[PDB]
């Protein structure tokens, strides 16, 4: 269970990394315009979940975690 | 931890390239709309191959 | 000097002249600088020259490859579109290696395309190759189908000898003499 | 499994429902590694 | 000297003249610089040449391809718009390789399209081919079914010998003599 | 002096001259500065030189590699593009290492590529190789097929002795005498 | 007075001359400034020299290393690219260390590349090596294969004597006399 929580926090950090870049590419263009008071969370959240459905990661994670144990 | 280092520095490399390219350009949005979704979708396509395998 | 085709290029006009000279009419390639080339025939040979243009479908289209439909500058590159360029550079390289044999003048190689084998739950199918070739006159072209069938076999993952199909042939009779001017 | 052979026909109305709205690249994938336990994680 | 067509293309005017010259009427191709060519015919031949324009549906439309309905410059490409641009270039490369055989002048291949098997869980089905060819006359065109069928059978993953349909024919009689001027 | 080709490269002109001089027709190579090279022949050798241009498919295309489709200056490279760029430099290095043997004048080496390597859960398959070679004449080219197989076997992880196919041959007869100008 | 190649490099032009002088024809290494070298041959020795250019595939291409596809000048690099950049420097260091033996004039070493088996739970396979060499004549080259295998065995992790293959050969005959100018 100790090596399983370590591997789950490593895979869970891997997923975390792309979105972080997705956030600052919204706040960069919003600071490039004159919308410094507008919060970026209403524009970053639409392009956070089209990156997840075009990549359709609900099937990619579910097939990969089965393929780490089982075999076909 | 080398795949933790490579994936942890490709993110900072893409922030410098993508968020910093219309800084030097603006110092036109339809030509920059199709470029960002190609790189973010390919970096997410690579990080699962480094994650689940 | 009635013109029938103009604005062609270097590789198309050298095909139209090589076709018309086979049927006893002579042509004239005239350069025009930036406007390409032009081809003129004589007035007695004009009626037949339009007939062999319509029959042989001249001028030829440029040859197509699968890698041109998926260009590298398309910065969004699917895994569906990366194996189509990997197949299309293998079938462009196997036919460049078939022409360096003993007697081969031209060749063409086709590979079966499977692209969706990575996203479904099914295993991928076998690979099917097919090849055409043209040999020199005087060659034993019956025993030379086992060298192409042996060279093509273990260049992929696992193909059989009944999954390769080689249809080869000899070249035509050579054209050497001049067509001759229409005397009037 | 004698009177447990009554319920497998009772769940047929739920089984024709769990094929129409699930994909058959995930239906067989949890089988070859349609069952009633092999279609709920895919639906 | 009554014109009947103008503004035509280079390959369109060669298809109008080769149709009119087959039926004993002669036409003049006149270039106009930027506004294309133009075809004029004589006054006793104007009634016949209008009838063959109506009958043969001239001038010819440009030939259509399936890869033109899905242009590659679009920002969003479906799996359907990528599978159709793949098959629409395999279909052109196969008919470009059929013309390099020993005796073929023109050819046309048709690949069966499969679209709605990828998005849902339905499995794909067997692919069907179809062909047309025009052979040089004096050739035994009954024995050449098996060479085209053998070449097409190993260019895809799963085809049968009764899933390939080849319909071919010999070419027409040659038109070599001039039409002739209408005297009055 | 009729003009056959113009605008060629440097090594595109040495192939056309070496082909034309094999068939008793003499060509002249003329440099034109920035616009490339040009090749002119005599007048009676024209209708015989366009036939060998159409037959031998001259001018030569540049030889294609698998590493040209996947450029290194992309922003992100897939694991498929890194293994295709690996295997293309391995078969480019094994081809240059085969030319330094005792007797080999030229060679070509093909490796089987893995395309669906990581997208399946399946382990990769065995590796197949193939090779072609051209030897200096006077050599026993049946015993020299057992040295290239020994050299190519343990240059990879695990290939067998029947997954390698070597097809090699001796070179053609030497052309050392001048063609000759056509007296008329 | 007639030119074969121009715009060459230094090592290219120093190898075309060494090939032409083997076949009794002589050339000239004419410098041109910053435009690179150029090679001219005499008029009776022009027809044979184009034949040996086409046969030996001259000018020589630059030698390819595996470290050129994965450059070190990039900012972020994959572990697959760092492994393929490491094995391509051990592959060159063992080649430069083989030239310091007693008698070796040139040598080449190939290493079996394994990059995709390091990530999964399957262990990496045993590594294979293969080498070529050219010895000065008068040497007993049957006994000198046992120290090349002895030097190459325990310079890696775990190889056997069956995974190393050495194919070596003596150097050719010396070329010391001048070719001779074509007298007329």
Give the C-alpha separation, F177 to G44, whole Å. Answer: 9
E80: buried, middle or exposed (CB in 10 Å: 19+, 13-18, 0-12)?
middle
- Determine contact, residues F124/F157, Cβ cutoff 8 Å: no
In a domain, F26, yes or no: yes
Which residues contact residue G69 at a Cβ distance below 8 angstroms, ignoring those fewer than 6 apart? Answer: F67, F72, F85, F86, F88, F89, G84
In a domain, C179, yes or no: no
Q: What is the largest CA-CA distance in chain G?
A: 76
Residue E107, classed as helix, strand or coil, is strand
- Which two tokens mark F9? 């490269």
Give the C-alpha separation, B36 to B46, whole Å. Answer: 16
Q: Which of F152, F177, F174, F171 is nearest to F163 (CA)?
A: F152
Chain F residues with CB-CB distance to B42 below 8 A: 76, 78
Please give the backbone phi and psi of residue E21, each rounded to the nearest 5 degrees, phi first: -70, -20
Which residues contact residue C176 at a Cβ distance below 8 angstroms, ignoring those fewer than 6 apart? Answer: F47, F48, F51
The answer to whether the Cβ–Cβ distance between A59 and D26 falls below 8 Å is: yes
In a domain, F183, yes or no: no
Question: Where among E60, E83, E98 does a domain terminate?
Answer: E60
Label the pairing between strands E164-170 and E129-135.
Answer: parallel
> E122-159: string of b/e by CB count within 10 Å (b at 16+)?
eeeeebbbebbbbbeeeeebeebeebbbebbbbbbbeb
Label the pairing between strands C104-111 and F104-111.
Answer: unpaired
CB-nearest to C71 from E72, E106, E123 is E72
- Which two tokens mark C52? 């062999």
Give the DSSP letter of residue B18.
Answer: I
CA distance F82 to chain A (A): 21
Alpha helices in F116-169 (DSSP H): 146-153
Residues forming a β-bridge with E112 = none
Q: Which of A14, A15, A11 is nearest to A51 (CA)?
A: A15
The answer to whether the Cβ–Cβ distance between C75 and B35 falls below 8 Å is: yes
Give the C-alpha separation, G116 to F176, whole Å. Answer: 52
- Determine contact, residues G138/G105, Cβ cutoff 8 Å: no
Verify that F67 and F99 share a domain, yes or no: yes
Verify that C8 and C46 share a domain, yes or no: yes
Q: Which domain holds residue E30?
A: 1-60
- Determine contact, residues B40/A19, Cβ cutoff 8 Å: no
Q: What is the DSSP string of E18-40?
A: HHHGGGT--EEEEE-TTS-EEEE
Chain A residues with CB-CB distance to F121 below 8 A: 67, 71-72
Verify that E67 and E143 share a domain, yes or no: yes
In a domain, E40, yes or no: yes
Residue C135, classed as helix, strand or coil, is strand
Alpha helices in chain C (DSSP H): 10-20, 46-56, 83-98, 145-151
Q: How many CB atoms lie within 10 A of CB E55?
A: 9
Residues forming a β-bridge with C133 = C107, C168
CA distance F184 to chain G (A): 23
Give the C-alpha separation, G88 to G111, whole Å. Answer: 8
Verify that F126 and F75 share a domain, yes or no: yes
- Chain B interface residues (partner G, CB cutoff 8 A): 2-3, 6, 9-10, 13, 53
3-state secondary structure chain G: CEEEEEEECHHHHHHHHHHHHHHCCCEEEECCCCCCEEEEECCCCCHHHHHHHHHHCCCCCCCCCHHHCCCCCCCCCCHHHHHHHHHHHHHHHHHHHHCCCCCEEEEEEEECCCCCCCCCCCCCCCCCEEEEEEECCCCCCCCCCHHHHHHHHCCCCCCCCCCEEEEEEECCCCCCCCCCCCCC
Q: What is the DSSP string of E28-78?
A: EEEE-TTS-EEEEE-STTHHHHHHHHHHHTPSPPPPP-GGGSS-TT-S---
In whole angstroms, how far apart are CA G135 and each of C157, G22, G101, G107?
38, 20, 10, 9
Verify that F134 and F66 share a domain, yes or no: yes
Give me the residue label for tokens 């109305």: D13
Verify that E68 and E56 share a domain, yes or no: no
CB-nearest to A72 from D26, D33, D41 is D33
Q: Which of C86, G62, G82 is nearest to F70 (CA)?
A: C86
Give the C-alpha separation, A12 to F135, whole Å. Answer: 59
Verify that F70 and F27 share a domain, yes or no: no
Residues forming a β-bridge with G154 = none
Q: What is the CA radius of gyration of chain B?
A: 13
The answer to whether the Cβ–Cβ distance between G78 and B53 falls below 8 Å is: no
In a domain, C183, yes or no: no
End-to-end CA distance of chain F: 14
The H or E element spanning position F48 is helix F46-56
Bond from prior residue into F59 cis (ω within 30 degrees of 0) = yes
Verify that E76 and E56 share a domain, yes or no: no
Q: What is the DSSP string of C2-34?
A: EEEEEEE-HHHHHHHHHHHGGGT--EEEEE-GG
Verify that F128 and F72 share a domain, yes or no: yes
Question: Where among F12, F42, F60 does a domain terminate?
Answer: F60
CB-nearest to D33 from A59, A62, A70 is A70
Verify that F3 and F24 share a domain, yes or no: yes
Give the DSSP letter of residue C156.
Answer: S
CA distance G125 to chain B (A): 19
Verify that G39 and G112 share a domain, yes or no: no
Give the DSSP letter of residue F122.
Answer: S
CB-nearest to F18 from G51, G69, G170 is G51
Compute CA E70 distance to the chain's CA centroid, rounded to the nearest angstrom: 21
The answer to whether the Cβ–Cβ distance between B6 and G120 falls below 8 Å is: no
3-state secondary structure A28-45: HHHHHCCCCCCCCHHHHC
In a domain, C128, yes or no: yes
Q: How many CA atoms lie within 13 A of E144 on its CB side?
A: 21
The answer to whether the Cβ–Cβ distance between G75 and B13 falls below 8 Å is: yes
Within chain A, strands assigned E span: none
Chain G residues with CB-CB distance to B13 below 8 A: 75-76
Q: What is the CA radius of gyration of chain E?
A: 22
Verify that F90 and F155 share a domain, yes or no: yes
The H or E element spanning position F49 is helix F46-56
- Determine contact, residues G128/G144, Cβ cutoff 8 Å: no
Residue C132, classed as helix, strand or coil, is strand
The answer to whether the Cβ–Cβ distance between G44 and F178 falls below 8 Å is: yes
In a domain, E39, yes or no: yes
Counted domains in chain F: 2
The answer to whether the Cβ–Cβ distance between G169 and F102 falls below 8 Å is: yes
Q: Which of E89, E94, E8, E93 is nearest to E53 (CA)?
A: E8
Subunits next to E (3 or more Cβ pairs <8 Å) are C, D
Residues 40-99 of G with CB under 8 A from F: 44, 47-48, 50-51, 53-57, 59, 61, 63-66, 68-71, 78, 80-81, 84
Q: Which of G29, C147, C90, G11 is nearest to F166 (CA)?
A: C147
- Determine contact, residues E159/E153, Cβ cutoff 8 Å: yes
- Determine contact, residues E25/E179, Cβ cutoff 8 Å: yes
- Determine contact, residues F159/F126, Cβ cutoff 8 Å: yes
Give the C-alpha separation, G93 to G99, whole Å. Answer: 10
In a domain, E183, yes or no: no
Bond from prior residue into F134 cis (ω within 30 degrees of 0) = no
In whole angstroms, how far apart are CA C40 and each of C26, C29, C175?
9, 7, 21
Give me the residue label for tokens 């060494």: G18
F152: buried, middle or exposed (CB in 10 Å: 19+, 13-18, 0-12)?
buried
Which residues contact residue D8 at a Cβ distance below 8 angstroms, ignoring those fewer than 6 apart? Answer: D36
Q: What is the DSSP string of D1-43?
A: --GGGTHHHHTHHHHTHHHHTS-TTTTTTTT----STTTTTT-
Label the pairing between strands F2-8 and F28-31.
Answer: unpaired
Question: Where among G60, G75, G104 does a domain terminate?
Answer: G60
Chain B residues with CB-CB distance to A13 below 8 A: 4
Label the pairing between strands E2-8 and C104-111.
Answer: unpaired
């Amino acid at each position: 269970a100790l090596s399983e929580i370590k591997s789950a926090f490593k895979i869970g950090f891997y997923l975390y990394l792309p979105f972080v870049v997705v956030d600052l590419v919204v706040s960069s263009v919003l600071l490039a315009l004159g919308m410094m008071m507008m919060s970026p969370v209403t524009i970053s959240t639409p392009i956070k979940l089209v990156l997840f459905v075009a990549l359709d990661g609900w099937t990619l994670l579910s097939k990969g975690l089965i393929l780490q144990y089982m075999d076909i | 931890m080398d795949d933790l280092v490579f994936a942890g520095n490709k993110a900072l490399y893409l922030v410098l390239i993508l968020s910093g390219w219309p800084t030097i350009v603006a110092t036109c949005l339809f030509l920059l709309s199709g470029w960002y979704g190609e790189v973010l979708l390919s970096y997410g396509r690579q990080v699962i191959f480094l994650a689940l395998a | 000097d009635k013109d029938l085709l103009k604005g062609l290029d270097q590789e198309q006009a050298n095909e139209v002249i090589a076709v018309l000279q086979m049927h006893n009419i002579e042509a004239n390639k005239i350069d025009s600088g930036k406007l390409g080339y032009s081809i003129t025939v004589a007035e007695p040979d004009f009626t037949a020259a339009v007939y062999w243009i319509k029959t042989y479908q001249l001028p030829p289209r440029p040859r197509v490859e699968i890698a041109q439909m998926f260009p590298a500058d398309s910065l969004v590159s699917s895994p569906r579109a990366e194996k189509a360029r990997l197949y299309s550079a293998i079938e462009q390289r196997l036919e460049q290696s078939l022409q360096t044999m003993e007697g081969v003048l031209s060749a063409r190689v086709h590979i079966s395309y499977d692209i969706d084998a990575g996203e479904n739950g099914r295993p991928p199918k076998p690979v099917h190759l097919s090849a055409l070739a043209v040999y020199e006159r005087g060659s034993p072209l019956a025993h030379q189908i086992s060298d192409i069938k042996r060279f093509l076999k273990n260049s992929f993952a696992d193909v059989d000898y009944d999954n390769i199909s080689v249809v080869l042939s000899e070249r035509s009779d050579a054209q050497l003499q001049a067509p001759g001017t229409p005397v009037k | 499994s004698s009177l447990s052979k009554h319920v497998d026909e009772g769940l047929d109305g739920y089984r024709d429902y769990l094929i129409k709205y699930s994909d058959r690249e995930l239906v067989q994938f949890f089988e070859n590694a349609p069952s009633i336990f092999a279609l709920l994680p895919a639906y």
